[PDB]
Amino acid sequence: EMVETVCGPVPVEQLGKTLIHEHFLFGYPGFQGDVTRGTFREDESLRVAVEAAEKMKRHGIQTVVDPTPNDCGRNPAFLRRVAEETGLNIICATGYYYEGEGAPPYFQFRRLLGTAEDDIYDMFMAELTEGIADTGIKAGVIKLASSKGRITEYEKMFFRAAARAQKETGAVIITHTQEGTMGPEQAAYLLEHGADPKKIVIGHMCDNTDPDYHRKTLAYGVYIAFDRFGIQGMVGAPTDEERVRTLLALLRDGYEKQIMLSHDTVNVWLGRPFTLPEPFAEMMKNWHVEHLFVNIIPALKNEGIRDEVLEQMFIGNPAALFSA
Amino acid sequence: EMVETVCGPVPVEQLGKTLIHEHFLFGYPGFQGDVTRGTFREDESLRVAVEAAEKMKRHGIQTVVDPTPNDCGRNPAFLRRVAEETGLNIICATGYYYEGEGAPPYFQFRRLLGTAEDDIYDMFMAELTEGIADTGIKAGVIKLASSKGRITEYEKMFFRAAARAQKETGAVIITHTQEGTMGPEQAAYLLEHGADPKKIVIGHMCDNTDPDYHRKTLAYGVYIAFDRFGIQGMVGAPTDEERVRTLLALLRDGYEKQIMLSHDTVNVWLGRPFTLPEPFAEMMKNWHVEHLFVNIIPALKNEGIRDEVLEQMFIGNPAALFSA
Numbered sequence: 001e002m003v004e005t006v007c008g009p010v011p012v013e014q015l016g017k018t019l020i021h022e023h024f025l026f027g028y029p030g031f032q033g034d035v036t037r038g039t040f041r042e043d044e045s046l047r048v049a050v051e052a053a054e055k056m057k058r059h060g061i062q063t064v065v066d067p068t069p070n071d072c073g074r075n076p077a078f079l080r081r082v083a084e085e086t087g088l089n090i091i092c093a094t095g096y097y098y099e100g101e102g103a104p105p106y107f108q109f110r111r112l113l114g115t116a117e118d119d120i121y122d123m124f125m126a127e128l129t130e131g132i133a134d135t136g137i138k139a140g141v142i143k144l145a146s147s148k149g150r151i152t153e154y155e156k157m158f159f160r161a162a163a164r165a166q167k168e169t170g171a172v173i174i175t176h177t178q179e180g181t182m183g184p185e186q187a188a189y190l191l192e193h194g195a196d197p198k199k200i201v202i203g204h205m206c207d208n209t210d211p212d213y214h215r216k217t218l219a220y221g222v223y224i225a226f227d228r229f230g231i232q233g234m235v236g237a238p239t240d241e242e243r244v245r246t247l248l249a250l251l252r253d254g255y256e257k258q259i260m261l262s263h264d265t266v267n268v269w270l271g272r273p274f275t276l277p278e279p280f281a282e283m284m285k286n287w288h289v290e291h292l293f294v295n296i297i298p299a300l301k302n303e304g305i306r307d308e309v310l311e312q313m314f315i316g317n318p319a320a321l322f323s324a
Numbered sequence: 325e326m327v328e329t330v331c332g333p334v335p336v337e338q339l340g341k342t343l344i345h346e347h348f349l350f351g352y353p354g355f356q357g358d359v360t361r362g363t364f365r366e367d368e369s370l371r372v373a374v375e376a377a378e379k380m381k382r383h384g385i386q387t388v389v390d391p392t393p394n395d396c397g398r399n400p401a402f403l404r405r406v407a408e409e410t411g412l413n414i415i416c417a418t419g420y421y422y423e424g425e426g427a428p429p430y431f432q433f434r435r436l437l438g439t440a441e442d443d444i445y446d447m448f449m450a451e452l453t454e455g456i457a458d459t460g461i462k463a464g465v466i467k468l469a470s471s472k473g474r475i476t477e478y479e480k481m482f483f484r485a486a487a488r489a490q491k492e493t494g495a496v497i498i499t500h501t502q503e504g505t506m507g508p509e510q511a512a513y514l515l516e517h518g519a520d521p522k523k524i525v526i527g528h529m530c531d532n533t534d535p536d537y538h539r540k541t542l543a544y545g546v547y548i549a550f551d552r553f554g555i556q557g558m559v560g561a562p563t564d565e566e567r568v569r570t571l572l573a574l575l576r577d578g579y580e581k582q583i584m585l586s587h588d589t590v591n592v593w594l595g596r597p598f599t600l601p602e603p604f605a606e607m608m609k610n611w612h613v614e615h616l617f618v619n620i621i622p623a624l625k626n627e628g629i630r631d632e633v634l635e636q637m638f639i640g641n642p643a644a645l646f647s648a
């Protein structure tokens with residue numbers, strides 16, 4: 001009946017309205033090497049992160065799951081500062097990213113030593129049950145990620161280790177899927193290694209616009225997340241209009257007890273600042289923590305989606321997910 | 325007349341006996357994610373690094389070039405602690421590793437933004453002429469690295485930026501070659517982009533046992549390094565016996581003014597500790613900073629190599645390399 005947050009154990013019944021997937025900080029692996037020109041400005045970063053948290057609170061959000069991977073600049077102590085300042089519950093993750101935006105050399109080397117999968121399991125257990133570094137903060141979810149059209153040999157080590165850790169702890173698993181691929185495959189592979197579908201959220205499912213793909217994933221009894229609302233503009237990637245269309249089809253089928261919504265925001269980028277080209281920037285303008293509440297939810301309600309269904313997704317589902 | 329060390333400017337004439345390629349600290353990208361079980365313990369690490377420095381001093385070494393890449397745990401302030409304690413000159417690098425043991429996502433993303441190559445040049449210039457982070461330490465070399473059988477599109481950004489920075493600063497370039505490939509190609513590519521061959525060291529040349537490959541590289545007028553003595557058994561390394569065989573062939577051809585020797589030690593590993601299996605462990609037993617002096621140099625002298633040739637490699641060559 002408890003979940004580990006960056007401020008310690010909190011009753012699951014008190015989580016309330018939740019965003020299942022947002023980042024306060026995030027950096028692409030390699031950002032650390034660009035420290036001279038891409039300094040981490042902690043004060044300004046905290047101010048921005050706190051402002052984001054306050055924007056969430058204004059729409060009734062009480063809890064955020066921040067699944068920033070261990071190799072992507074995860075900073076539990078920083079998250080704790082945000083939570084202490086705002087009263088928001090923040091749940092962090094233990095896990096590594098997928099190969100293309102991860103840092104595989106370290107555990108690839110340990111794989112050559114023959115200990116990598118066991119080391120990963122040990123890491124998960126340490127961070128779920130003991131604490132991260134010297135912070136005293138425990139992770140509340142395991143973050144998994146796969147590549148485009150493939151769960152690689154490297155990635156599979158983490159999947160297997162995650163299943164082992166989940167069996168021992170009852171921990172929630174949150175995943176990344178790449179470019180609308182591998183949803184059913186992730187669910188199937190985790191379940192074959194004994195993971196509990198009621199403790200799994202298959203992420204970035206909104207990237208795929210074919211509802212049959214979602215239904216294949218939902219068939220495993222897992223949660224799915226439409227967690228990238230506001231991200232638009234890349235070549236073959238979907239629009240919010242497409243995301244909403246897909247979501248409406250699944251709600252019509254009665255899948256609301258398996259669906260959660262988020263934005264996958266990056267409120268503070270680690271490394272050097274950057275700007276997107278003007279056409280791309282305009283397309284990305286809705287990518288912020290208020291977008292679900294100001295734009296998407298009103299659109300769902302315009303289509304006749306009832307408040308009880310919306311409450312199921314934002315309140316009921318996180319409560320059920322984190323409950324034994 | 326001067327080179328930047330971790331303790332500031334030192335006259336090139338005062339560098340004396342030098343090891344061209346050793347790591348006080350090193351981690352494979354991703355080590356940061358295993359912080360809980362693999363925390364950097366600074367007091368013990370400093371004790372070990374200081375001991376390594378004292379071992380090198382006992383054999384007359386006055387200077388070490390530590391080319392730890394920016395994405396592999398480079399810590400200039402730590403190197404400065406070692407140097408302040410021991411009086412050893414330590415010269416550090418600016419650069420990123422090759423793809424397979426690097427963290428490319430960050431600069432791959434900036435390549436997509438259209439700024440990466442200019443950003444890398446900016447970083448090199450900042451770190452060579454201003455300082456690394458808030459340390460006040462300037463790098464004295466640029467570290468470059470290529471993959472097996474090719475210099476990738478990613479890697480080439482760094483090669484071009486390095487040639488540009490060299491033209492501007494006169495900085496020395498130190499390279500990594502992967503599995504005995506791309507020696508000639510690196511030299512050719514750098515010179516094509518205006519780099520000075522008398523300021524370039526093509527590294528890991530000892531991995532290749534065909535002296536024609538070395539002669540092809542040497543014809544560009546660059547330095548080469550047999551810089552991995554002690555590494556045998558693993559990663560396809562030749563044996564030290566094979567390294568010595570190749571080296572003797574080149575010294576007898578009269579190439580001593582273009583050759584330098586080192587071990588490429590990792591004195592303190594970043595991340596979780598590890599042990600090699602007993603067969604591998606035994607093969608790697610000589611991989612330490614005293615090996616060239618206790619074992620290899622005596623083997624060379626047993627093969628008729630004179631003190632004047634040895635002094636050319638360890639004293640004359642580094643002095644020439646770092647001189648205008």
Ligand SMILES: [Co+2]
Nearest residue numbers: 175176177204
């Ligand atoms: Co993701």
Ligand SMILES: [Co+2]
Nearest residue numbers: 021023067264
């Ligand atoms: Co994310």
Ligand SMILES: [Co+2]
Nearest residue numbers: 499500501528
């Ligand atoms: Co190397």
Ligand SMILES: [Co+2]
Nearest residue numbers: 345347391588
């Ligand atoms: Co090295």
